[PDB]
């Protein structure tokens, strides 16, 4: 465990360090298995040009089209935080995501902590950023509630989760359970897989389907260990 | 085998092209001593002669050239 | 057989032509041990085949299976560590069985209301290298 007695997680992603429709999906599956309410934030929109913003929003809407709260905030310019502040009030929110995405900087901006005390902030070099914050610290929200700064992560793999729990984790799949002619429908190429055609007509996000399949096949690679996770 | 010593030869001559050509393959490669049965010092003399002949184009370096 | 490559047992000749191949044919065609049904079917089919082919019905069966017997077939091998197809020749005793097997399945697919007729029609087309029994033989030769 990283943090307990949590009420809400906020998946913090940023375009510069890495854009990963795969890590976001792994986090969504996890929090769905943990019943914790998630929320997606995308940091450093200041780096993207206006065309690039219109190029990132039409796939950030993938999740807001299945209800997920999706916000875009620039920590350096403090742009568009204000709805994030509102969504953060009066709850317990763990700031999670890859290293370098801006989780510490976002906290500095939101908390408005005294200048003498600030979270460590090093800039990313080449492909990926450093791991500055190596701890998990609680912070009292100014208005109400608490946030938690967490250390950056590389792989949020899910071999502990059962394969069915991944189908449940994708919320856009309940609309098609029991609609597959083969009852034990792996849904990849099995005939009559409802979600197959569903994504054929664009009802489902293709990227989400491919991510589901690839994380399933990833579980096969990491099932090599005989250690137990129960 | 060991014909050189058997004839007590003192020095193998590069100019001869009929004798030492029994010691190269059709591709012109120096046949190893394991199968010719020649002895070490004579094998070395043979290699030097053969390289000399190659230099003066009495023996081809390779079947292609 | 990992340790002992056991030899195959002998089949008894058929009580109507003393032909080992005919008995093997009825053994292949048999279903649920109902030998009598199979022998009825095979004798009916052979006799109608005789009517179309005139004399020597047992011989007509021989040349029918001959026109579709396989010579070369693909075989799998894992020596490479990956699935590997290889074209290999077939022993006569085995290609006999392969021809008989292909004939009977093709007949079952033919339908048209009677097994007697299906078998006879397939045999009649086989006798002249046709009926798709030869086509299945031709495709596995092409796969060499």
């Amino acid at each position: 465990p990283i943090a307990a007695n949590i009420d809400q997680i906020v998946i913090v992603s940023a375009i510069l360090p890495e854009l990963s429709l795969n890590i976001i999906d792994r986090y969504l599956v996890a929090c769905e298995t943990l019943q914790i309410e998630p929320i997606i934030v995308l940091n450093k929109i200041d780096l993207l040009d206006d065309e690039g913003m219109a190029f990132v929003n039409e796939q950030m809407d993938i999740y807001r089209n299945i209800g997920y709260r999706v916000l875009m905030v620039s920590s350096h310019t403090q742009d568009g935080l204000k709805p994030l502040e509102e969504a953060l009030t009066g709850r317990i929110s763990i700031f999670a995501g890859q290293s370098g995405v801006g989780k510490s900087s976002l906290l500095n901006a939101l908390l408005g902590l005294q200048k003498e005390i600030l979270t460590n902030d090093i800039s990313d070099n080449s492909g990926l950023g450093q791991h500055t914050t190596t701890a998990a610290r609680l912070y009292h929200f100014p208005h109400g509630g608490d946030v938690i700064d967490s250390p950056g992560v590389r792989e949020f793999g899910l071999w502990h989760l059962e394969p069915e729990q991944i189908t449940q984790g994708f919320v856009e799949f309940h609309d098609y359970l029991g609609l597959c002619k083969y009852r034990d429908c792996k849904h990849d190429t099995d005939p009559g897989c409802a979600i197959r055609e569903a994504v054929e007509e664009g009802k489902i996000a293709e990227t989400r389907f491919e991510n589901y399949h690839r994380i399933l096949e990833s579980m096969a690679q990491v099932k090599t260990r005989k250690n137990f996770s129960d | 085998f060991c014909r050189f010593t058997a004839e007590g030869v003192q020095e193998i001559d590069y100019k001869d092209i009929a004798t030492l050509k029994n010691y190269i393959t059709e591709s012109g490669k120096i046949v190893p001593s394991r199968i010719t049965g020649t002895r070490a010092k004579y094998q070395r003399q043979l290699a030097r002669a053969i390289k000399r002949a190659r230099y003066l184009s009495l023996l081809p370096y390779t079947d292609r050239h | 057989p990992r340790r002992r490559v056991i030899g195959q047992r002998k089949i008894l000749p058929d009580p109507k032509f003393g032909s080992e191949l005919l008995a093997k044919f009825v053994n292949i065609l048999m279903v649920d041990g109902k030998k009598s049904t199979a022998e009825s079917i095979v004798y009916s089919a052979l006799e109608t085949l005789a009517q179309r082919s005139g004399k020597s019905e047992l011989e007509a069966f021989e040349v029918a299976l001959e026109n579709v017997r396989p010579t070369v077939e693909v075989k799998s091998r894992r020596v490479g560590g990956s699935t590997y197809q290889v074209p290999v020749e077939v022993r006569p005793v085995r290609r006999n069985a392969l021809a008989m097997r292909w004939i009977v399945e093709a007949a079952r697919k033919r339908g048209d209301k009677s097994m007697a007729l299906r078998l006879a029609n397939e045999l009649s087309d086989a006798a002249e290298n046709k009926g798709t029994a030869v086509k299945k033989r031709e495709d596995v030769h092409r796969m060499a």
């Binding site: - | 393959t25 059709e26 591709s27 490669k29 079947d63 292609r64 | -």
Partner: protein, 66 residues
Amino acid sequence: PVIKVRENEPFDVALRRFKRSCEKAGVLAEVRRREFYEKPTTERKRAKASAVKRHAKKLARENARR
């Protein structure tokens, strides 16, 4: 390498003698041992190991009976 056909010679025997000639020169092993550079240290160690293995095999040849 070079194999010249004669008059009234079957093509198959010509092919087989050509291939057995080219493999008598070991040309394939030559072009395969010159595909990647091999540091002289690894060359020396593998040569020495092959040699000592040869010596051990020729020793086993004559230590069993005696």
